[PDB]
């Protein structure tokens, strides 16, 4: 894969940060909420 | 033409104020 | 029903060729071969063994679309009892295995709502009825017009 | 504390699971004249002693279907079983039947709950109790 | 737990009594009918909500009547 | 021990709907009451509380049974001799395709009575009919006429039987019971004499016409099959071991009979069938095994077997009191018996399905594709049937005739004990199994997709040997002389050898087993192992569950115990029969798609003279079987192009049925994925519009019941999806010639 | 008697048999000194032994099956597959540590507290990932190691 | 080393299991045996 | 001739059954 455009290293990086990062990031912090058992 | 690496990079910058405006929206919604 | 009409109709006007709609539309013979047979053959190609074309990811959601409106059938047709005697089967399952006796679910496991079940049948129904057509649309156009 | 002899039982993966030493389990008690076999609501067969039984099972639907079964598949009828509820912290609550009486026939003393002076027909409309957090049936 | 709630139709034959795969009901004296009992419910919270109890009931427009509410594990029928 | 007129013949009672039901005798009140009585004739243990009279109706409605089979033989054999062209046929075999159904000239329907040779005009029969009449050496349409005559008098004698036997003169209980004796009668009579009765008519009758056929004799020239009985010296003309008589059967020489019963194996090269010498050789071992079998168990000189010690000696440290009073169940309930038949019976149509295509035992059979085709998915869609009737009668057993203090610490409570551990082990193979099979096809769809064909699953990347399969196909191979000394060839030319190439068509040739072979069946694996947990969890959990403990005391066939516990509907064994239906349909839907694509793969299709055959699909199965993508295009899409350009031709019966299918599927929906809720306020609507101009019936109107509206659903979707594909694998094989 | 088959710790209503697969004494002996039972241990060690063998395992499938097999990186890739699936499994452990043991601490077994599931993520993920990149370095120098073993250097 | 006889990888994988894996294993299985201050 | 890689490996298969069945025996003289 590559890229003529502009800055064609971010989607290089953000393809596994918006595919991986934030997805496992997102779970793990709701998987971590939805289960708190702090007051109700 | 088309446009820059600094043009890409400043409309990134720019969109860290929507998600900052975001995530205070949401915070003040949830409660 | 109307977008198969509208596709089957502009296929004929685009293309010139009228008289197929005109002479096959008034029979449900003609709907099944010359609108959905002979349309998607191009859409079925996208991908094969002897190569690619651009129309290989309109081939690969076509079905896509099949599996997700198949899926939702799970759930439309059998119904939540059956699941919940299946899973309290597999809560003994796990109850019962060492090393994995160590790791016990937070919210014990249940079958889907009857309520749910419907919504999420008709969830992967609706899905899978979109993407199929859609696929088809766009892989069936762009192939003879585009 | 509760007494009888447990009933003799090959054993069955149909049993207690962690709930039972983790949330709560059911025990059911009778007196038997005979040593006859019963079917376990859990699956199999399995043989009650003579004289004191006391049973342990996950539910409070497994003891009544056992005691559903001791009133009516019996020539003998058992109808002396006590359903209790078991906490892990040892506390053992009578459940059944709770009067010394069954259900179905009446007794003094018994308060009536969960009953209404109204008819079906004239419980009020929803749009009458909005933003009260109660629905029709609880008013 | 869920609701049972019991209306004033009542006659008194005991059948969602018999029906009740729980101990949710008994019967208590009354004088509505020419039984003299109507049905209550005071375990409801052992109540799984199988609505036999409204099978059973020969009122037309049952005068027991069910509503699904809160669930436990003892309303979700769970043995673990 | 048989009563003496029980029951009277009065014709009053037929006039009176309901009578087998007390609460149907009431009269009609809700149109359920119909929808009851059609449900409720033949659950003779629930009308009926003795086993005696339950036994009564059984017998005089297998006797029934039997007139309506033999009505069905008849009308076949009618249809074989008047409007048919066996005649034209027998002279020519590979110019005239089979056709023994003639349609009148009405509507424009005579366009289905296609040209099939000979100047005939009718509907190419599939059923293979006069492969077996030729097999059976018939040669004159007198003949089937007499054999259509006699079976209207043999079914005339079965209805008589039937109500001789319920209406006259009735047996008592333990003449049921006594299953020793029945076992002997069934093994060493019904199976052992008829197989031996039918060597001696192979050997007398069969083989003569059958040799003189494929010498090149006309069928006129053959004379008649009676006057070879009535002179011996035709034998000895044609097989010259008929010169000794009966000597050497009874003084241990046998080898005299090496002539006209042989162990040749593979298949007759001027038909495709199998010999018919071997077939003769095969049903006289049969016969003598069977008779030897049918004298196990002691009936009435106390020689022999009891069943009842023969289960009670076998128990070990793993299963406690063992086999401990199956005797009684087997002898007392009539639904554990049914289950074991009807799977015992399923298993055996599915086998003969798999065994009669490669080694096709009928004359120029294998040659018709379609003749084939249609033979192995119609013993296929039988034998998956009675295997889920198997799972239905376990669990209707389970709920009305399974007694716990009658069964302790045997192996069926040891069943019922450890039923949670059999499940979900069964379970975890079942999803297993979908993914290392389903997403093995999912992953080369993506590869294929992606542009990454070296990454796939296939034999021309990651390779997936089938490599048991091959070493027992080559074990196979060299089994005839090594392994079989005696064999002359292989037992069947699909495990390796040469093609047979009667005429310019093919009948059978080494198949190949690759990794779309290995991928398809570990396909019908898990299908067939999810059918079975589904049915095995209905029979095992029919009684209770830690769900729903009181579940016997709902029954078999009830829809729910409502919304509660979560919602508890298809709980019964009834619904688990209701989904075990669906997923034996697409097991067997997938068994049948791997038949015909790999058939007219690597099978069929058109042989040179040279030697080199060109299949019909042109060997497509290697490369385009392990997609869903090639499973839908080179197989569906491509193969449908027979059945849609229908129309027009004598084909178009099979375009229409094409459409109806898939009518009646979608049809099933609508009682598929819906309530009788809305459909009982939607009929109290229309109640109301009879209401207003007085048209309101005496019998109210009812929507379906929940349990009903089920059945209706899977009925009309294995009818729609069954005729779907029956029409397109015919108009497809009758397309490819 | 000679049954095999008995009641699980003599008690035949709580839900579970006395195999010869669940209660033999090769069964409990083998499960029971496995690093996640074994007496004494603490949670750090048990993690590291499981994580060893958890991540000296992971190398391989994408080692002969990934999408770099063919390529001269092959024990690369199948290396960085390992190292990730390793990161995502410790990452899944802590978070279920954090779930399980919000509130009160047990006094029986140490692994099963917020401290001793801590103590025992720690140690898988440490084990995991030298695990890999040990399985790696075997591989990667997998000449050198049949030299060893053939004695070609000796 | 090596083998012209069939699999030749069993000896290049089994000498040192024989020689390391299988004696380690089975003395420290003894050593914690004849060490197990359990019953007498 | 010499023998096959898959003779080697079935015969190491087949030795997988006297190894269990001498581990029983043992157990069973331990006792
Ligand atoms: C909502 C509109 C939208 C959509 C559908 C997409 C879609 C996509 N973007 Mg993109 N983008 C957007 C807005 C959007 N963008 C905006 C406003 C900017 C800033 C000017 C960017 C800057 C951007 C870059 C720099 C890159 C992409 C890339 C991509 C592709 C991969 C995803 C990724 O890495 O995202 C990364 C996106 C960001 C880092 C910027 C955040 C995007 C916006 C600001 C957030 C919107 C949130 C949403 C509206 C909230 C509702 C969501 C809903 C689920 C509830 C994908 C086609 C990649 C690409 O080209 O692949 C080929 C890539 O490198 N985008
Ligand atoms: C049970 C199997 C079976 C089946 C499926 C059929 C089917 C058929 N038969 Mg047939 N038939 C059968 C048994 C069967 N028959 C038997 C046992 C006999 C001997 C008594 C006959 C004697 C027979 C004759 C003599 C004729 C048919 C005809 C027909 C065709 C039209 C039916 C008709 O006239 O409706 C009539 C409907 C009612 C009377 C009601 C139809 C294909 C006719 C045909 O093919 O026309 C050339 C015809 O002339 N049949
Ligand atoms: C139920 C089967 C059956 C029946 C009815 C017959 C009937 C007959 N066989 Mg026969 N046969 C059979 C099975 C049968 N066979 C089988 C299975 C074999 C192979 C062992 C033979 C081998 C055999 C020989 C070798 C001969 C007969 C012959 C005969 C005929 C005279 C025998 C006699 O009266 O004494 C008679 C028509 C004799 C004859 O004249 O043939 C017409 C004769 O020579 N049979
Ligand atoms: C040896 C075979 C055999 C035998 C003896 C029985 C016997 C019995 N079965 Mg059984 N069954 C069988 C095979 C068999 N079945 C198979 C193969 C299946 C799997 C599909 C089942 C599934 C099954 C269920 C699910 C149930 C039974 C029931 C019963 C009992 C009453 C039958 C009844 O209600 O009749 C009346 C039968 C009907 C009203 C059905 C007629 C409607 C069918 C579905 C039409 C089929 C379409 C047709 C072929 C083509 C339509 C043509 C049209 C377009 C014109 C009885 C003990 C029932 C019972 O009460 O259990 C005790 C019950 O609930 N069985
Ligand atoms: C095509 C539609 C479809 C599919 C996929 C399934 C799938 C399944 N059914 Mg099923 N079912 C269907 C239609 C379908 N059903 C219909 C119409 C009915 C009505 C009669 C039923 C009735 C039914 C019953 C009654 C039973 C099942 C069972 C099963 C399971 C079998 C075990 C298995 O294969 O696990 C493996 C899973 C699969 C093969 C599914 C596909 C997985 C894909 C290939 C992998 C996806 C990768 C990844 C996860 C994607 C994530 C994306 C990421 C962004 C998150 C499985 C979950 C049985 C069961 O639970 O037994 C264990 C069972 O008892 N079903
Ligand atoms: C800016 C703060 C920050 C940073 C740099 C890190 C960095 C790290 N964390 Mg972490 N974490 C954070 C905040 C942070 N964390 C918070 C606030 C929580 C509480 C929810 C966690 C909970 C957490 C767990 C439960 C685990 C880690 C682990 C790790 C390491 C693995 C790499 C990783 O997660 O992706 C790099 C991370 C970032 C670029 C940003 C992370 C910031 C968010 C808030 C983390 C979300 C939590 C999520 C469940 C963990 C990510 C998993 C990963 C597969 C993406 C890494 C050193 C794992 C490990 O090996 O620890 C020994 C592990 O098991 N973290
Ligand atoms: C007791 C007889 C015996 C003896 C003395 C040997 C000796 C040897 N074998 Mg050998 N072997 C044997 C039986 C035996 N084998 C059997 C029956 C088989 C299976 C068919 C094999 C299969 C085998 C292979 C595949 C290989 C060897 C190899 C070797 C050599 C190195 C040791 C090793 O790695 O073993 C490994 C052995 C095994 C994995 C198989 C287990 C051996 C048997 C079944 C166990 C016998 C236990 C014993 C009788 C118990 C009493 C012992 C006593 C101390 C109390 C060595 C010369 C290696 C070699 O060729 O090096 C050049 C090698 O690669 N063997
Ligand atoms: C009978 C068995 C046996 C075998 C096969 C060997 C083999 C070897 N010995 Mg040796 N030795 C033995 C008995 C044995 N010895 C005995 C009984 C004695 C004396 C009492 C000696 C004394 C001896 C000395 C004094 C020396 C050797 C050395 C060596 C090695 C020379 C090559 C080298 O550098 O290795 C390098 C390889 C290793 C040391 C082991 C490699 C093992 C792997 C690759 C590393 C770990 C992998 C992983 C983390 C664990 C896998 C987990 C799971 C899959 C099992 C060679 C491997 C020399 C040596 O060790 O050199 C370093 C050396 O100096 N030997
Ligand atoms: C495809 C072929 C190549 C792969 C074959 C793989 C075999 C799979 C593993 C072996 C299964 C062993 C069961 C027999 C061994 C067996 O019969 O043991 C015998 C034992 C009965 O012992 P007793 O001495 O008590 O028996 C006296 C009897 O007469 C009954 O009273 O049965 C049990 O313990 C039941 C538990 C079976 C538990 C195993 C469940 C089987 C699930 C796997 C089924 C897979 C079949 C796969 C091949 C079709
Ligand atoms: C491939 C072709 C299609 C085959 C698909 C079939 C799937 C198998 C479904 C079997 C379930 C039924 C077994 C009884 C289970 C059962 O009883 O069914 C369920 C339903 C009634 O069940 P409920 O639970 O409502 O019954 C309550 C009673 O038990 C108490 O009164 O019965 C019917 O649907 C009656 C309608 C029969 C319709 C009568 C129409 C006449 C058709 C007769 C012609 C038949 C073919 C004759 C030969 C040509
Ligand atoms: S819903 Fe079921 S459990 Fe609840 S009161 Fe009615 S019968 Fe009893
Ligand atoms: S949805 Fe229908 S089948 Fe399911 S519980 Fe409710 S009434 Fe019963
Ligand atoms: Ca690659
Ligand atoms: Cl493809």
New interface residues.
Partial sequence: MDGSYAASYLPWILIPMVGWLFPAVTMGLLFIHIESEGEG | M????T???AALVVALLPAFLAFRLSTELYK | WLTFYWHWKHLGVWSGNVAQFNENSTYLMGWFRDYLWANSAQLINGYNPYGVNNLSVWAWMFLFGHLVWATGFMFLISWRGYWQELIETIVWAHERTPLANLVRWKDKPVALSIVQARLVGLAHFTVGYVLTYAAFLIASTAGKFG | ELSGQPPKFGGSTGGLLSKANREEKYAITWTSASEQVFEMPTGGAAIMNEGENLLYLARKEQCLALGTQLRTKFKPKIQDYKIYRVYPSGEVQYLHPADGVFPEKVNEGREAQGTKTRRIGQNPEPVTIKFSGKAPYEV | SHSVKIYDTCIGCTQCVRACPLDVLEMVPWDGCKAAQIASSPRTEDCVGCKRCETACPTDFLSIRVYLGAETTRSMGLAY | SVDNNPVPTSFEKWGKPGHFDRTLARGPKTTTWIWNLHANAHDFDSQTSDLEDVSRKIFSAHFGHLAVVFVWLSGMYFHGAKFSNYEGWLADPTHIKPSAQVVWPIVGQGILNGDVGGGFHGIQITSGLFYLWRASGFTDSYQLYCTAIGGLVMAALMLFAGWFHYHVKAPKLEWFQNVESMMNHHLAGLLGLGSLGWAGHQIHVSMPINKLLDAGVAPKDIPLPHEFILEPSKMAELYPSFAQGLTPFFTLNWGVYSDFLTFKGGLNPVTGGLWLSDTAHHHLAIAVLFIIAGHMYRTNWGIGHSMKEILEAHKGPFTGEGHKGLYEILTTSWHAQLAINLALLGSLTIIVAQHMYAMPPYPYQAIDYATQLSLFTHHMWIGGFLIVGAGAHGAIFMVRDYDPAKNVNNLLDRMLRHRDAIISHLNWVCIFLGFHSFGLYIHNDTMRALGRPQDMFSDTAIQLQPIFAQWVQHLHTLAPGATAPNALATASYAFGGETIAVAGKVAMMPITLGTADFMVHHIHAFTIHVTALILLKGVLYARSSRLVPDKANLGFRFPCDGPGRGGTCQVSGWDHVFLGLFWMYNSLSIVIFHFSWKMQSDVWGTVSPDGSVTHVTLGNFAQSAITINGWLRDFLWAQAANVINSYGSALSAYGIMFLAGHFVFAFSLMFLFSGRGYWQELIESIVWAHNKLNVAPAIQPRALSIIQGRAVGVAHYLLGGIVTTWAFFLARSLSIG | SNQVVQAYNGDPFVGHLSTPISDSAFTRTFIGNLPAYRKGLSPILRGLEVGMAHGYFLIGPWTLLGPLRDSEYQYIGGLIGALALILVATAALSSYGLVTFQGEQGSGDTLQTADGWSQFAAGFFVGGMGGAFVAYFLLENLSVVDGIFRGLFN
């Fill in positions: 088309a446009l820059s690496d043009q890409i990079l």
